């Protein structure tokens, strides 16, 4: 699923994220768009052979098991095709266990790129 901008928002809200260890709903939609364009099934390989899953391209080197990753572990303790679903429970669940292992939301470097420092409630303008 291609979520729309102000859809998404409202099912992030529904989910908890909005200002989760701090992080307004604009920090959250900005990520998502730039990590995956809002496409719940969106998928990226990393170098090291890891695969980033979902609307917010978790990493299967440390949070989910895609059954190809060698030495990696599954902290959300999830199949990493949770990731990919229309409904982004798994993915919300598993980002705040992310965001709370001590650095933030610069877990995400798309974030630290591309959000961190704008104006990010811009993200959330314009949404019921
Ligand atoms: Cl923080």
Redesign the pocket.
């Known amino acids: 699923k291609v979520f729309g901008r102000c859809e998404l928002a409202a099912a992030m809200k529904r989910h908890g994220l909005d200002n989760y260890?701090?992080?307004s709903l604009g920090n959250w939609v900005c990520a998502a768009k730039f990590e995956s364009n809002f496409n719940t099934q969106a998928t990226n390989r990393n170098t090291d052979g890891s695969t980033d899953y979902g609307i917010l391209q978790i990493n299967s080197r440390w949070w989910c098991n895609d059954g190809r990753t060698p030495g990696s572990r599954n902290l959300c303790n999830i199949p990493c095709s949770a990731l990919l679903s229309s409904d982004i429970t798994a993915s919300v669940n598993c980002a705040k266990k992310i965001?709370s292992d001590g650095?933030?939301?610069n877990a995400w470097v798309a974030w630290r790129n591309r959000c961190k420092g704008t104006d990010v409630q811009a993200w959330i303008r314009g949404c019921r």
């Open positions: 260890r701090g992080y965001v650095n933030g939301m």
